[PDB]
Amino acid sequence: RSSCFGGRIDRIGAQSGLGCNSFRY
Amino acid sequence: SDLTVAVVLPLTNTSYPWSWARVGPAVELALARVKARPDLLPGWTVRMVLGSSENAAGVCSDTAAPLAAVDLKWEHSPAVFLGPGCVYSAAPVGRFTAHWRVPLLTAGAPALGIGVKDEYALTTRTGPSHVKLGDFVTALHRRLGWEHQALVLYADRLGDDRPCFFIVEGLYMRVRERLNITVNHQEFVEGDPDHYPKLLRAVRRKGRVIYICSSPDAFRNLMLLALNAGLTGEDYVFFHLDVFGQSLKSAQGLVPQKPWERGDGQDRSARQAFQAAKIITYKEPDNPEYLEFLKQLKLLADKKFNFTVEDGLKNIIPASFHDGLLLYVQAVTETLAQGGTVTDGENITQRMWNRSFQGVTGYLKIDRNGDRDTDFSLWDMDPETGAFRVVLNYNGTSQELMAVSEHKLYWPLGYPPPDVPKCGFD
Amino acid sequence: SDLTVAVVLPLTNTSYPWSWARVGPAVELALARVKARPDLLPGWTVRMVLGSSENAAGVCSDTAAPLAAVDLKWEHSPAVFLGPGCVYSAAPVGRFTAHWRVPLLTAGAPALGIGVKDEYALTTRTGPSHVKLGDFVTALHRRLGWEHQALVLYADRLGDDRPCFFIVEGLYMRVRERLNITVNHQEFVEGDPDHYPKLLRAVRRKGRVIYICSSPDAFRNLMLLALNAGLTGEDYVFFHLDVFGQSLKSAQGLVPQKPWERGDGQDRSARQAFQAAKIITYKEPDNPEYLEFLKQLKLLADKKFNFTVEDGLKNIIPASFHDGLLLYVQAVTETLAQGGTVTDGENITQRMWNRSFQGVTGYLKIDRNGDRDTDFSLWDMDPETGAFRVVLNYNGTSQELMAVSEHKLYWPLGYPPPDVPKCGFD
Ligand SMILES: *[C@@H]1O[C@H](CO)[C@@H](O[C@@H]2O[C@H](CO)[C@@H](O[C@H]3O[C@H](CO)[C@@H](O)[C@H](O[C@H]4O[C@H](CO)[C@@H](O)[C@H](O)[C@@H]4O)[C@@H]3O)[C@H](O)[C@H]2NC(C)=O)[C@H](O)[C@H]1NC(C)=O
Ligand SMILES: *[C@@H]1O[C@H](CO)[C@@H](O[C@@H]2O[C@H](CO)[C@@H](O[C@H]3O[C@H](CO)[C@@H](O)[C@H](O[C@H]4O[C@H](CO)[C@@H](O)[C@H](O)[C@@H]4O)[C@@H]3O)[C@H](O)[C@H]2NC(C)=O)[C@H](O)[C@H]1NC(C)=O
Ligand SMILES: *[C@@H]1O[C@H](CO)[C@@H](O[C@@H]2O[C@H](CO)[C@@H](O[C@H]3O[C@H](CO)[C@@H](O)[C@H](O)[C@@H]3O)[C@H](O)[C@H]2NC(C)=O)[C@H](O)[C@H]1NC(C)=O
Ligand SMILES: *[C@@H]1O[C@H](CO)[C@@H](O[C@@H]2O[C@H](CO)[C@@H](O[C@H]3O[C@H](CO)[C@@H](O)[C@H](O)[C@@H]3O)[C@H](O)[C@H]2NC(C)=O)[C@H](O)[C@H]1NC(C)=O
Ligand SMILES: [Cl-]
Ligand SMILES: [Cl-]
């Protein structure tokens, strides 16, 4: 598992990160 | 001479708020009311073709649902799709129906990305949206002096539709869009005890206004550990993001409402913990048409679907399918009334959008984006009895927080604690 | 009497490594070699039906590609699918073909999740995989004494296939699966200057072994700012995750290789910066069959596809489609040879898996998981000339790092700097 990586392949689960470390969003 | 409605929902699994065992009778009720109304589609015989969104194991599927959508599209050429309600079912079907120029109605699919109607064109959501939860949290913060920092804890079960992720994503994005305060977030795994030291530590380092999206038992255990570690309502407030009231009984009976009560000899400790805990849920519709709809839904589901519709907040999903369907038939009839056809998806959709409507759920406003405004209730403990009750109510269309039955939101200090402690978090 | 191959790739956009203008001639070469071989499918006439994976704007699409897959499946009932190469195109098509019990071959789709063959059953990847990048990084760390902490910076363009995200995911997950060291990560936006203070600060606080997946110019600018802020090869090593060698010319000519050279009077500063920089790429195939394949690919693409195939690492994708197609025809012929049929997807697939093969790319091993082992080169600066050249080579099947032309990987200190500084990062 991971908070950011491994969560399906669909643009629906890539609208905010929210588990990830990002400067965008 | 007849209207073809394609349905893509769970036809066999009855565990979902939008399962067909529960949505099917609500749709039958709506079709029967179209028949009895001579002002809605006079002469048309609205037929329905069904398609299961669930895979071989029975859970809703990012593969079964879009396949079912293609099967119904080429076999019946429907004018409108109904469902799915799962986020990962609804996204691929949504993109198909957007490309097919076919309207899509659903009371599920509350994810942030379905709201991008540039992609999900002609998608109309008549149930809750998770950005609307961000609207409520925004009003809650404005009306309480929290303008700095909040912490969000969320956990899902591997292999589900990730409900808490999408709830937290909607809250996170909308709240920072409107308040731009620091919203810390942390995902955990409920069955993994390794995470509870990390969580408790992260609670006393990353926020004082704390939102937790999790199972009732996880929220309970997290509260017990917060009391055991001396985190009380004087400094901390713990909101349980329990939109379907899973931690509470239905608003019909079962008086009183006790989420901390479990029967494991811990209930005495849990009550003192839950003194710092408030629960956010969808709002039960008040109007008597709802209660009458509930009685007719229970009868029709037991008769034609061999299913027993229990009481609870989850019933607003079948009620919203019901209302959405009538709101669509109105719009089609209006489109036919001005020279359109049943396949003028964009004309039909724009009649439904930015429009108020009266249904079994009471007043429902489709906003400019094609998403129903969502009303929320805030539950709080009465310090005398210890039971939880609605003390605040949020009208999603007007964005107003109204006190409920002259109740007062309980604070151990007499007022909400500051979202940032005294001399920093250290 | 004939075999139907369904293709779902970009039929019109030629910007992709797996575009049809480049993969189509490589496939025509492979079909022509099947015809000329009496040991591969004797008498069969392998037919091809095309489907474009791109949307109306021309970019590869999570909607066009699965729709195209359904069209080809019900119109032709193919025995095998070829493509897509985009991750978001390949994931829905992969779940369809898994459900249709139809094998799928692609040299694209390198994302971590495609590797879950319980879901993407009968999916065979004959091109690179991003977990294989994690294997190379693992070997690089073991063979260099870095067993504590690395930092990963990655950026994408909004609306693309997120290539850098998936590269970094494959690296991140596999490296911690095998070394369990601390891998800090940070996403940025290349065109957003606000991020470069944040990145430079995060470089000097979250790691000394630093991997960057970005465009050449972003990697160059980050290097220039790291020199300007006094970050040199004595303490830091910056790996550019440039798997297709976009920052380098082709290995055919254009001697020498200078990525820091841009013609803006900064090239003098850039060279001293790039003294701390190494570039990770796919390995150019050595074998002379590859060069002959390249000559024939260029001729056939200019003749039958009106396209000009320039030299470069991206050509390993059409070469691997070629090789995977031949590797499949062998398996079908072997399945026919032992009483099977062309639709014994699982039998055919298992003949292809855990199998070594000889193709125009040389030695290629399909592992137990159905994914081709991937070889990587490591480029380094010659401190005399300043030009970059391959100094290390990674064999993916044996996981060995062998020096290249007796070269030495340059270090300003004589050996790699420690992945953790002296008295911590403070
Ligand atoms: C959440 O906030 C919403 C935002 O205000 C509320 O919406 C309001 O809802 C009320 C009724 O529920 C609505 O009132 C009028 O709506 C008609 C359109 O303007 C108007 O024609 C009506 O007037 C007629 O009927 C009344 C008797 O009811 C007569 O006295 C009049 O002479 C006339 O014949 C009716 O008054 C508001 O327009 C509407 N506001 C907006 C901005 O949409 C929601 O009701 C509220 N929900 C809850 C549960 O509190
Ligand atoms: C990356 O590492 C891989 C793992 O070691 C290498 O794979 C090895 O590749 C070689 C050839 O490329 C292969 O050699 C033998 O393969 C046959 C199967 O065992 C065997 O029958 C062959 O033997 C025949 O031919 C030789 C002459 O070539 C005669 O002398 C023999 O008597 C016999 O007739 C051949 O020797 C290895 O088996 C294979 N190893 C594994 C574990 O798969 C890759 O080659 C390497 N790639 C690069 C680019 O370095
Ligand atoms: C009806 O739907 C229910 C929820 O969608 C479903 O409950 C869940 O069932 C799944 C199995 O499909 C359980 O999970 C497992 O999922 C994968 C697939 O096997 C495994 O690899 C995982 O490790 C995990 O064990 C869920 O835990 C379970 N959740 C709950 C709350 O019960 C029902 O099974 C469905 N019932 C029918 C009859 O279809
Ligand atoms: C062939 O494919 C190229 C890459 O897939 C593509 O390049 C890119 O074009 C897109 C437009 O589709 C640019 O981006 C924009 O995408 C959305 C959709 O309009 C916008 O909302 C975004 O804000 C963004 O501006 C990319 O920037 C661009 N990328 C590159 C590297 O050029 C070509 O346009 C395609 N060409 C043809 C003929 O199909
Ligand atoms: Cl569904
Ligand atoms: Cl593609």
Short mmCIF file of N, CA, C and O in Angstrom, two decimals, chain A residues 1-3 7-8 10 12-13 15-20 25, chain B residues 62 88 95 113-114 116 154 160 165 168-169 173 176 185 187:
data_model
loop_
_atom_site.label_atom_id
_atom_site.label_comp_id
_atom_site.label_asym_id
_atom_site.label_seq_id
_atom_site.Cartn_x
_atom_site.Cartn_y
_atom_site.Cartn_z
N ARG A 1 0.82 -1.20 0.00
CA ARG A 1 0.00 0.00 0.00
C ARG A 1 0.86 1.26 0.00
O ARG A 1 2.07 1.20 0.20
N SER A 2 0.22 2.41 -0.22
CA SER A 2 0.86 3.71 -0.13
C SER A 2 -0.22 4.79 -0.08
O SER A 2 -1.31 4.60 -0.62
N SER A 3 0.10 5.90 0.58
CA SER A 3 -0.87 6.99 0.68
C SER A 3 -1.07 7.67 -0.67
O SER A 3 -2.16 8.19 -0.95
N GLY A 7 -3.10 3.70 -6.19
CA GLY A 7 -4.54 3.87 -6.17
C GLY A 7 -5.20 3.90 -7.53
O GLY A 7 -5.54 4.98 -8.03
N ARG A 8 -5.38 2.73 -8.15
CA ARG A 8 -6.11 2.55 -9.40
C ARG A 8 -5.55 3.39 -10.54
O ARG A 8 -4.67 4.24 -10.34
N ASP A 10 -7.33 5.73 -13.04
CA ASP A 10 -8.44 6.49 -13.59
C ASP A 10 -8.20 7.94 -13.23
O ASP A 10 -7.76 8.24 -12.12
N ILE A 12 -10.22 9.90 -12.34
CA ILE A 12 -11.10 10.33 -11.26
C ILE A 12 -10.35 10.34 -9.92
O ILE A 12 -10.61 11.21 -9.07
N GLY A 13 -9.39 9.44 -9.72
CA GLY A 13 -8.62 9.44 -8.50
C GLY A 13 -7.32 10.23 -8.58
O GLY A 13 -6.41 10.01 -7.78
N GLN A 15 -7.50 13.96 -9.04
CA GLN A 15 -8.05 15.31 -9.11
C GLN A 15 -7.55 16.23 -8.00
O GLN A 15 -7.83 17.42 -8.04
N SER A 16 -6.84 15.69 -7.02
CA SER A 16 -6.31 16.50 -5.93
C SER A 16 -5.05 15.93 -5.30
O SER A 16 -4.50 16.56 -4.40
N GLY A 17 -4.56 14.76 -5.73
CA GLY A 17 -3.59 14.07 -4.91
C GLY A 17 -4.26 13.68 -3.61
O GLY A 17 -5.07 12.75 -3.60
N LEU A 18 -3.92 14.39 -2.53
CA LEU A 18 -4.54 14.30 -1.21
C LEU A 18 -3.88 13.21 -0.37
O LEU A 18 -3.93 13.25 0.85
N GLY A 19 -3.19 12.26 -1.01
CA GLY A 19 -2.27 11.43 -0.26
C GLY A 19 -0.84 11.84 -0.54
O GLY A 19 0.09 11.49 0.20
N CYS A 20 -0.67 12.62 -1.60
CA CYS A 20 0.61 12.94 -2.19
C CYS A 20 1.19 14.22 -1.61
O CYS A 20 0.52 14.99 -0.92
N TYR A 25 -2.49 21.91 -6.96
CA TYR A 25 -3.78 21.57 -6.36
C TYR A 25 -4.08 22.40 -5.11
O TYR A 25 -5.25 22.64 -4.78
N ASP B 62 -15.51 -1.03 -12.15
CA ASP B 62 -15.08 -0.15 -13.24
C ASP B 62 -15.06 -0.85 -14.60
O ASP B 62 -14.71 -0.20 -15.59
N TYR B 88 -16.28 4.71 -9.12
CA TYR B 88 -15.49 4.05 -10.17
C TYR B 88 -16.36 3.38 -11.23
O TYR B 88 -15.87 3.13 -12.34
N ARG B 95 -18.21 9.14 -18.97
CA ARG B 95 -17.48 9.59 -20.15
C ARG B 95 -18.05 8.99 -21.43
O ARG B 95 -18.00 9.64 -22.48
N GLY B 113 -14.37 14.85 -9.23
CA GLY B 113 -14.13 14.89 -10.66
C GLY B 113 -15.36 14.76 -11.53
O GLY B 113 -15.37 15.28 -12.66
N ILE B 114 -16.40 14.06 -11.05
CA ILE B 114 -17.66 14.03 -11.80
C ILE B 114 -18.22 15.44 -11.96
O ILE B 114 -18.97 15.71 -12.90
N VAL B 116 -16.67 18.03 -12.97
CA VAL B 116 -16.10 18.70 -14.13
C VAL B 116 -16.99 18.40 -15.32
O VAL B 116 -16.76 17.44 -16.08
N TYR B 154 -8.66 10.00 7.39
CA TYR B 154 -9.58 9.19 6.62
C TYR B 154 -8.99 7.82 6.40
O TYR B 154 -7.77 7.66 6.33
N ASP B 160 -12.78 -1.32 -2.03
CA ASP B 160 -14.08 -0.67 -2.08
C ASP B 160 -14.03 0.53 -3.04
O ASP B 160 -13.04 0.75 -3.74
N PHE B 165 -12.01 8.53 0.92
CA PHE B 165 -11.10 9.32 0.11
C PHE B 165 -11.87 10.41 -0.63
O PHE B 165 -11.49 11.58 -0.61
N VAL B 168 -13.27 13.08 1.59
CA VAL B 168 -12.22 13.99 2.05
C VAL B 168 -11.69 14.85 0.91
O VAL B 168 -11.34 16.01 1.11
N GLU B 169 -11.67 14.31 -0.31
CA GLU B 169 -11.21 15.10 -1.45
C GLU B 169 -12.16 16.26 -1.72
O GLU B 169 -11.73 17.39 -1.94
N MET B 173 -10.73 20.07 -1.22
CA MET B 173 -10.62 21.00 -2.34
C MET B 173 -11.56 22.19 -2.18
O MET B 173 -11.14 23.34 -2.32
N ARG B 176 -10.43 24.64 0.83
CA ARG B 176 -9.29 25.48 0.52
C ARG B 176 -9.55 26.40 -0.67
O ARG B 176 -8.89 27.43 -0.79
N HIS B 185 -3.87 16.46 6.16
CA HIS B 185 -4.61 15.24 5.90
C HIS B 185 -3.72 14.03 6.13
O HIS B 185 -2.50 14.09 5.93
N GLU B 187 -4.05 9.55 5.77
CA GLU B 187 -4.77 8.31 5.55
C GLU B 187 -4.26 7.21 6.47
O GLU B 187 -3.05 7.09 6.71
#
